[model samples]
Target: SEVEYRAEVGQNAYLPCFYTPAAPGNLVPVCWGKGACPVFECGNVVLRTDERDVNYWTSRYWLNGDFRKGDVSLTIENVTLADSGIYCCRIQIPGIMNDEKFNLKLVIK
Candidate 1:
């Protein structure tokens, strides 16, 4: 499914993405990408997390949610027109066809 978000220039945009694992344990690897999520992998990854450590490709992107509790939302600081586009969040789960995906379209006005 896809979600839509809107923000004004110089404002912060929050793209929501939360998941609950069926197995119940630590949260798995999650990533935020700049465009539509590809069939095989996350496209244009902007932020990613391995366990508790987070890797950011740009300074404007941030994961301000509690990842361990399954809140892997992406936050874009200082929203700009150029930053408006499609975004995706992918949660890697074990086993085949178990990955969770969330798509978001961001609009800056």
Candidate 2:
């Protein structure tokens, strides 16, 4: 599914994304990217997390969601006009063409 978010400059924007593992002990690796998610990969990753740890590429991006609980939402802090664009959230599953994707459009005014 897709979502749209509106925020003013210097405000925080929350882009929601979530998923559930198909089975027990499954590791869900997810990423938030700047544009549309590429097949089997996270394009222009801004934030990423797995069962082990989380990685943020810049100070403006944050993954505050609980990884184990499948809350891989992206939070953009202090947004600017340059930050307005299509954002993608990708959940990487262990299988062929099994990744789950979500697109979010951010509009900064």
Candidate 3:
């Protein structure tokens, strides 16, 4: 299901992306972006915990997820009007073609 998340300006916003597999492993990497496009290819990446190539965002982005505990969530500090959009999270296991994706419509007010 698509989730619509609401947050106010100057407040932190939490976007969640969870995956419970049969076995717990850090092989599953997570990436966060905005809009409905391919993360590594086109979408504007806000903060990618498992990646460092597309890191235009300097600060205010925190990876709250513990890979050991299966938490793939992101926290953004001091959200602004530019933050009002659909935040997309993706999880792809290494050496696997299939992946998991979640979208949260962030409505900042």
Candidate 4:
């Protein structure tokens, strides 16, 4: 449930994190965080969005302000060398299902 990608400072990177709905009309929550922790957590909640602001960052992190259509991709803008570390996306699925967290390693130069 993890992946890696690279981007230069001041460029953009799309951190992908998606999940399939267990059933129709299901509401999924998605979010991304930046930190050096071992798990997908901590730091500023760049973009925390859901069907619920629903219309949702540090350094201009973007989620298009929506994910009701199943797009849990996070866009990091104006990246920097300080961002060359652990980044992750977390998805909340309904029912007894556990939340999914996708990790990303960003190497910025």
All candidates' lDDT scores?
Answer: 0.81, 0.79, 0.72, 0.67
State which candidate has the highest lDDT: 1
| Candidate 2 local lDDT, 1-109, one digit each (tens) | 5457999999999988888866664556777789877776667877766543344454688878776777778889998899999988988776436678888889899
- Which residue pairs in model 1 clash with each other? none
The digit string of per-residue lDDT tens for model 3 on 4-79 reads 8878999999877687644655545667778864635326777665547454466777776675566778788999
lDDT of 1 by residue, 1-109 (tens): 5457999999999999998755456657687888888886677877767643344555788878887778888899998899889887999877436688888999998
lDDT-based ranking, best first?
1, 2, 3, 4
Ranking by TM-score: 1, 2, 3, 4
| 10 residues in a row with least lDDT, candidate 2 | 49-58
Question: TM-scores of the models, in the given order?
Answer: 0.82, 0.80, 0.78, 0.71
**Per-residue lDDT of 1-109 in model 4, one digit per residue for the tens?**
5556889889987677667655564566666778633343434566666443334434477766346666777777888788788776777665545667677777788
Listed per candidate, the RMSD to the true structure in angstroms reads 3.2, 3.4, 3.2, 4.1
By summed lDDT, the worst window of 10 consecutive residues in model 3 runs over 36-45
Candidate 4 ranges beyond 4 A from true positions = 1-3, 22-27, 36-43, 50-59
Worst 10 residues of 4 by lDDT: 50-59
